[PDB]
Design a binder for this molecule. Sequence first.
Ligand SMILES: [Ca+2]
Ligand SMILES: [Ca+2]
Length: 275
Amino acid sequence: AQSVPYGVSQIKAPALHSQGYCGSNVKVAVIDSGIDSSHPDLKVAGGASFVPSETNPFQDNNSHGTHVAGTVAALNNSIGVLGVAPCASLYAVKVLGADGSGQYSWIINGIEWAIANNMDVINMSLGGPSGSAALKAAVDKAVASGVVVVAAAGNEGTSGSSSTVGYPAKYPSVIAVGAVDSSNQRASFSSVGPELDVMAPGVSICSTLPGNKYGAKSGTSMASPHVAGAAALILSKHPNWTNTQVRSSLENTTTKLGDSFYYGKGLINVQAAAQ
Ligand SMILES: [Ca+2]
Ligand SMILES: [Ca+2]
């Protein structure tokens, strides 16, 4: 039997699925630890590895990339779970090793690859406390080229009155995603600041794991792919919308929560965003 993870329903994805909108022909790049292409509930279309010691993008020695990928696009069938955009074309852009860390050079290499390969949506469930001109240039180039760039906000919680949003989420060109639970309450770990854009489910998220498994994980890493998948749904309904239009629609139709420093614009609603 297939289960629908709470988070998928919470952002109102199933409403679109019912209409026949599931992200078909939308190219989504998961820039992370790779995706287990052998998982029966996923379909990987392609990708690349930029980790020097782990040349196969289709082997996830961490489990993080695979989990993120399932939130985006676990297949609509009779097993496992269901992704926000189950018909999307999924790409494994491996920039993180087995330990879940990776060099900036590798990440930037992955964004450059995504732009050159005409990805529609980029998901980056990763972050560092420091930026670089090259990192900023790459995300800006992607947006300038019409790509929707989504990133996790960070898991740093609160710190007095300062922003704890990480990079590249901190850049204006990137959509920065914080995490809520099933009751719409902000997760205590979710990073905060004026650079936070939207919220999505991020606590105890069930998704795919390598080796034909499924398990829950919590983090802004789990929130981001709900927004990435939401963008893919929008593009499947309005293929001529620009990245700017997708972004504005997502931000403009949220369910408002508390203060924007903690919740950004609020919780995404893909049904409202899709018009
Ligand atoms: Ca499934
Ligand atoms: Ca941002």
